Symmetry: C2
């Protein structure tokens, strides 16, 4: 229904992760990604946090997807997608970063 | 260069939160609440609490109004300026009963 859906992601240190938040049924209602520190990454199609590694895969009413390139072990953690229905709905994607053997 | 200030409001009253940037190009401002929920991202409303309104948004100022305040609204609101790296200024909202 009108609920944000995300999945856990696993990526190798140095590789590129893609975090995807989807909504089955939606209008206008805005989506937003934040990082483990709760800082905003994108608000719909508008970049927030300047970090040149974080870029926009897709922004629409049904999808908000972002790529983190050249990931490091310190990107590991819980990312949150928020959809601004009243009350707000959230869904978490835990990003795991594997070291190179 | 984000600059905000502590604000006092009597319970049931309306508080205004103002964030100021002395010189700015086209870098974004965002207010968020003590839970860290985004309220306004520039002129774009986020959290849907219909008590929260936009007073003013431009590159030099982001101001929002909280009408009808309650005791649970008390605390640290943060203004963010998305420079590289990000800069923040907190305003503390005191609500008296
Ligand atoms: C996603 O990751 C967290 C990491 O601890 C975990 O609790 C959760 O179960 C994971 N999702 C699953 C198992 O579907
Ligand atoms: C989307 O458009 C509506 C019209 O119903 C506009 O008034 C409103 O601000 C937007 N609503 C959102 C973002 O929830
Ligand atoms: C704003 O409020 C907090 C905590 O009550 C305080 O630490 C800060 O100094 C305050 N602002 C002033 C004194 O202007």
């Amino acid at each position: 229904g009108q609920f944000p859906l995300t999945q856990n992601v696993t990526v190798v240190e140095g590789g590129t992760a893609i975090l995807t938040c989807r909504v089955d049924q939606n209008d206008n209602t805005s989506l937003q990604w934040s990082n483990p520190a709760q800082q905003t990454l994108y608000f719909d199609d508008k970049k927030a946090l300047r970090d040149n590694r974080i870029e926009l895969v897709r922004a629409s009413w049904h999808e908000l997807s972002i790529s983190v390139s050249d990931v490091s072990l310190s990107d590991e953690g819980q990312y949150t997608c928020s959809l601004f229905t009243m009350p707000v709905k959230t869904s978490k994607a835990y990003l795991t970063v594997l070291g190179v053997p």
